[PDB]
Design a protein around this ligand. Structure first.
Ligand SMILES: COc1ccccc1CC(=O)N1CC[C@@H](O)C1
Ligand SMILES: [Zn+2]
Length: 140
């Protein structure tokens, strides 16, 4: 589990969105595994606006933050899980690292801010949904 709290937005994995998220929906995209809902309180996270390929992510199944090298956002085939059939996921970045299903939502960050959240995993890989192209997260 986990979310990004920027401005009056909450960014979560679409497959983990709650009823309150769907009832306060701003934007969602199944191909990216992302959903954004509106919040009453202002958040403290800032979004990175860069092309970094190194950063650090939080892994809840280890209680640890790990430094990683990750690929550029791309269209990658992801195997079937309990939330999606096997399909192509867009804007996804891969790295070598531990993940389990409940690690989804952990933040990946670089020197500029939040880069994305854990969305996929297995066999020593972790995939992150990028958010750096969503410029509207920085405005009302
Ligand atoms: C961190 O995720 C995992 C790690 C190990 C194994 C499996 C996963 C879950 C995973 O790949 N997905 C969840 C739904 C869809 O977004 C894809
Ligand atoms: Zn950066």
């Amino acid at each position: 589990s986990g979310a990004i709290y920027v401005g009056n937005y909450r960014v979560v994995n679409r497959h983990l969105a709650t009823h309150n998220d769907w009832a306060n929906l701003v934007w969602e995209d199944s191909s990216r595994d992302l959903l954004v809902s509106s919040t009453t309180a202002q958040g403290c996270d800032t979004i990175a606006r860069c092309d970094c390929q190194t950063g650090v992510y939080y892994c809840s199944s280890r209680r640890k933050h790990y430094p990683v090298s990750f690929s550029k956002p791309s269209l990658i085939f992801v195997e079937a899980s309990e939330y999606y059939p096997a399909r192509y996921q867009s804007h996804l970045m891969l790295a070598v690292g531990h993940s389990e299903p409940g690690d989804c939502g952990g933040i990946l960050r670089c020197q500029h801010g939040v880069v994305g959240i854990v969305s996929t995993g297995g066999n020593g890989l972790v995939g992150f949904a990028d958010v750096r192209d969503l410029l509207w997260l920085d405005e009302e």
